[PDB]
Enzyme design. Structure first.
Site, PDB file in Angstrom:
ATOM      1  N   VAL A 176      74.367  16.852   4.512  1.00 10.93           N
ATOM      2  CA  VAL A 176      74.552  18.218   4.946  1.00 10.93           C
ATOM      3  C   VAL A 176      73.565  19.102   4.161  1.00 10.93           C
ATOM      4  O   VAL A 176      73.818  19.492   3.013  1.00 10.93           O
ATOM      5  CB  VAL A 176      76.023  18.684   4.764  1.00 10.93           C
ATOM      6  CG1 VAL A 176      76.890  18.079   5.858  1.00 10.93           C
ATOM      7  CG2 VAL A 176      76.554  18.248   3.397  1.00 10.93           C
ATOM      8  N   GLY A 177      72.420  19.393   4.772  1.00 10.13           N
ATOM      9  CA  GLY A 177      71.317  19.978   4.013  1.00 10.13           C
ATOM     10  C   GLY A 177      70.797  21.281   4.600  1.00 10.13           C
ATOM     11  O   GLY A 177      71.407  21.879   5.486  1.00 10.13           O
ATOM     12  N   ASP A 198      65.391  28.771   6.028  1.00  9.62           N
ATOM     13  CA  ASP A 198      64.086  29.462   6.039  1.00  9.62           C
ATOM     14  C   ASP A 198      63.461  29.331   7.435  1.00  9.62           C
ATOM     15  O   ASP A 198      63.833  28.450   8.220  1.00  9.62           O
ATOM     16  CB  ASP A 198      63.078  28.846   5.033  1.00  9.62           C
ATOM     17  CG  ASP A 198      63.661  28.611   3.632  1.00  9.62           C
ATOM     18  OD1 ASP A 198      64.344  27.574   3.425  1.00  9.62           O
ATOM     19  OD2 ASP A 198      63.389  29.436   2.722  1.00  9.62           O
ATOM     20  N   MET A 255      63.723  17.572   3.178  1.00  4.47           N
ATOM     21  CA  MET A 255      63.066  16.682   2.222  1.00  4.47           C
ATOM     22  C   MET A 255      63.774  15.394   1.880  1.00  4.47           C
ATOM     23  O   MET A 255      63.475  14.815   0.845  1.00  4.47           O
ATOM     24  CB  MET A 255      62.817  17.496   0.942  1.00  4.47           C
ATOM     25  CG  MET A 255      61.796  18.610   1.187  1.00  4.47           C
ATOM     26  SD  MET A 255      61.554  19.622  -0.496  1.00  4.47           S
ATOM     27  CE  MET A 255      60.040  18.542  -1.139  1.00  4.47           C
ATOM     28  N   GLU A 256      64.687  14.919   2.736  1.00  2.00           N
ATOM     29  CA  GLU A 256      65.552  13.765   2.389  1.00  2.00           C
ATOM     30  C   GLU A 256      65.776  12.728   3.482  1.00  2.00           C
ATOM     31  O   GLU A 256      66.066  11.557   3.194  1.00  2.00           O
ATOM     32  CB  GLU A 256      66.950  14.241   1.921  1.00  2.00           C
ATOM     33  CG  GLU A 256      67.005  14.909   0.542  1.00  2.00           C
ATOM     34  CD  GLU A 256      66.540  16.376   0.567  1.00  2.00           C
ATOM     35  OE1 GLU A 256      66.572  17.019   1.642  1.00  2.00           O
ATOM     36  OE2 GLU A 256      66.108  16.889  -0.492  1.00  2.00           O
TER      37      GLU A 256
END
Lengths: 234, 236, 236, 234, 234, 236
Positions: free
Chosen positions: E87-88, E203, E179-180
């Site tokens: 969950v990012g 963003d 990033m993951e």
């Protein structure tokens, strides 16, 4: 053997390696006593003599990664060389780095594929022997030379297609461009011996100054003196 | 006067040049086959000569070993000295049983492990290729000379002392004739600059057999190759 | 106020910073060696502190593990907080028999399998390199401290749990001292932004031997490294 | 087998390989006698007949490296084919190379990854069989055709993102772009047989002329005649 | 083990994986009952509790491919985790994709070398577990969320050299950058377990809106609810 | 009239198209499932047809084998003929024990060894991905049809006859369902051009088992897949 026409014993444990065999000749005639020429195969002059009583050798390597790859390998494996000090020329990538300045290569960036091939496309950083870096730096400072020590770019290409290509490297702190060191450091590391590159700035991407062929062959004395004093301490 | 690697003036070099790797071989070719010889280069000991062969001006110059070295010399010769035809004359190691020692190989193209073109073409595969006019002229001369001539792909190696003894075999399986260290650069540079290039190679050893040849035997075969190169030069 | 990863104001961070990977190690360094400590960051738990060492302002902050993580922190610290000198203080696994557990390694340069520079330089090999002034100062301090110090190339690994148990050996054959996970990024970023960087590493384990060390032993060696880093900080 | 519905014996030792199966049909009906169709799998028409008394075959390969990879492999390994002559079309990269000119591919540059994968990222140069090059060149010259022989670009992409991308290749002497040859030459070399590509220029990056679909299928007769005369001498 | 200070049994079979350990704390305190903290090594907080009666875990992974590589591997191999739901947060590459929107990653493009190294330079596409994709999508739709499901870009670099670099990816339909995920999906596939990434847009490369650090830590509730409801159905 | 590879006029092709690799399979689909069929293409024998399915206009066309071939057809169909939804309907070889012969695979994404995107993204890894709306519609249809459906990553191979018999295993270890030769190109092209794409695949053989199936059995399963594709087409 195929490239150096001499026997084990003819070459000293420490050797200076200009790219230019005529510069090896100059170093031998100008700085060494009791000089013997041990090699003339392919005109790649190699000499052994004494510097302040200690045996040292000097030999041309030719230009480029593949040429120095050949000579450094043979020197180490067949002649028992333990310390290899390249004394070369390079073009500045930094306003801070002026024509006739002396630079120590702590490491070498490269566009050669020699290591890309070996490490499955990862990034091996060819690195100098720390002992030689420290000794050469100290000798230089004690001589009044403002010597820089940093990353140099070893290129396969002297005449690039893109006149602005150097700028990316300079942005990331690359001091100058030459054509041998990434290979010398790689081979030295692989074979368990010691290596250092000293360079004299002979061209500048900033100011566009070009030194003459004569100047590169017989007038870059400061780097030679540093290298010889370094050899003396090894 | 000159370039940082060739200490001569425009006009000192003929429009056709032979390019041994070894500058002492350039000296030998000049002494043996050329008349009224003048030495135009001694920079870095990279001997270059100009003389006539059967009345025609021809040059001959060492290139050093490896893609970067010949990259410097070929570029300067073409752009500064107006060279139009460049003929490498070298030695190579055979990768094929029917490519025998003392055979002559004409490089139609050059495979390589140098990164020079990988960088240029964003990781694609450029095939450095000989000038066909020179391939055809050289083949017909060599054949009429009765020589055992092969024409094909050669491997331009960046590394003489490689990690892996068996690595050549992959290239041999894909038809590569032999290994040398200059041709991919020569052909790429000539193509870029719009001039003509050819590599001729005498097979000096074999990765497959271990046949021994006398120095007299080796000299004779080498002279034959040079004759092919010079008779080719004559027709350009 | 701040950046999306550092919740502090310009001025809160000193011009020299120590960079452990572990933010709990940053807390330890701050408590153990610094006076008048202020915590300036808690964003994502990435603890950062500022205090004085022998009267001089110095900061210390966790970076997280891996090239991308330190890439974020080093970039923000330099561009937003005006950091000029960045000294990583970490642990590493030895690849060499003469690089023994509890030795201190100074990274002159960093090899890597991260693609960060392969992308930037069109597939060429950039060698991320330490600031020589910092290498020289740290070496002389460590030596005078009587420490067993080595200076050389370290490997910045992208993958802690790799497919191949023996893969480190290739790197070890080519002289790589030890493996860690941050330095190639630190050195590249500092070079790009025109600032100074150094990595110091305590050897915590060995790929070659299986020597065991007490927590007291490990603490003592770690403290020695921090002292080297802080005495270095003093002279900048 | 999965792709060619025929038995060993049905295909001759020498085969012409247009990319277009309808062009194979045209060649067979126009130039051969005693024609038998040996393949219709996936509509990839293949025919065997005689040309001036000598048995020859013609079969479509489809477009692209992977498609010709399939057919060339099966032809060689399962049908005993020894000489493979691609007769294709290509777009000119040179002002010197005009729509309807005939070109011999001495070698093929490529953006395919087929060889990058196999040679650990090094640069294999797929190269034609010299005998076929020489014979085809001589036949062409004796016909009055100003045939060029040089490097061609084998692309995976007909519709590139960058309209100027071709220009880099043209700067380095690439004659034209097609989509099969790097694979044909690679497979022929690997399997120990002989291969040649002849091309007719069907498009031009210089003048932007585009020939019609009909023109490519039934009107590029000059290359076909060269290929057939070549086969006759093998 | 070196990175998670706990025993098998302490972690549930299904785990939520924010990059931020303080966000794991938030999820645990806000959504779970009977919470136990099982990890504080390197401050990488990990908690186990119940959500509507079912045991679930939540733990920070840190930022970047290498960090999540470490935690996902240990979670699977040493703690027996079977379902991993990242969950990012991510930056939008599409006008269609707005700050605070929720996105499902069906697949992850990447500039990481982790797979280039393993597949000899070929292109492995890290892909989500279809069951989790379907369940999460349905839950989202039943909640009134216009959730998109598509390709995301996993980058090693937050601060790129080229401000326009993202545009190439957006042209080819990439929804956003995080990033993951390329690593999470790769490791899950390799180890035979199940993985899904949910993202909240924090963003935007289109509008240049940046959410605060506080907002990312404690206010992206919609994605958390989807993930928890998903876990409940596994 | 048309393009150099499709000899038809704008309007001749429906907005949704089915894409078998084999143009004879396009002919079969058209004859078997469509009404009022018109053939719009015969260029290079690449048969394309337009008819109605349950009153709705739908097209079907062969693509040829391999990334470059489908690259040509998909690009022209989208840019010249206004195709909005492209559904490949193919065969594949299973890499997984639980991906059984006669199963239907929906490609969520495509791994590849083609260099098409490596070139485009400077050596980075782009993951060609299906349109989710089409994945979801096709899955629900297949499920309600009672079919054994899997949804996941497939491998788009550039080389049918590879050097290494075991090379598929690496891909199988990383969860790849099956191998085919077109999908990475289809998904990349549709993404670039802002349109919708889906690949459905019937498992025709297995790298793991060696189960044999009758032609009647194979026909029935293939028809089921086409029905899924056409019922999907209906809802777009």
């Amino acid at each position: 053997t195929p490239h150096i026409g001499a026997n084990r014993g003819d070459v000293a444990e420490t050797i200076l390696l200009p790219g230019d065999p005529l510069r090896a000749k100059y170093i031998a005639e100008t700085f060494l006593e009791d000089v013997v020429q041990y090699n003339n195969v392919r005109g790649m002059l190699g000499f052994t003599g004494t510097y302040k009583g200690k045996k040292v050798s000097v030999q041309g390597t030719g230009m480029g990664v593949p040429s120095i790859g050949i000579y450094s390998h043979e020197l180490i494996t067949e002649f028992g060389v333990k310390n290899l000090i390249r004394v070369g020329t390079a073009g500045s990538y930094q306003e801070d780095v002026k024509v006739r300045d002396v630079v120590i290569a702590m490491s070498a960036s490269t566009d050669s594929a020699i290591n890309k091939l070996r490490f499955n496309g990862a990034d091996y950083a060819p690195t100098a022997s720390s002992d030689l870096v420290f000794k050469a730096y100290e000798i230089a400072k004690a001589k009044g030379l403002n010597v820089k020590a940093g990353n140099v770019f070893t290129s396969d290409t002297f005449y690039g297609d893109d006149p602005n290509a150097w700028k990316k490297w300079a942005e990331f702190g690359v001091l100058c461009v030459e054509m041998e060191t990434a290979q010398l450091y790689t081979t030295a590391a692989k074979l368990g011996v010691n290596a250092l590159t000293l360079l004299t700035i002979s061209d500048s991407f900033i100011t566009h100054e070009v030194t003459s062929a004569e100047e590169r062959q017989t007038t870059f004395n400061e780097m030679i003196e540093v290298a010889l004093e370094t050899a003396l301490q090894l």
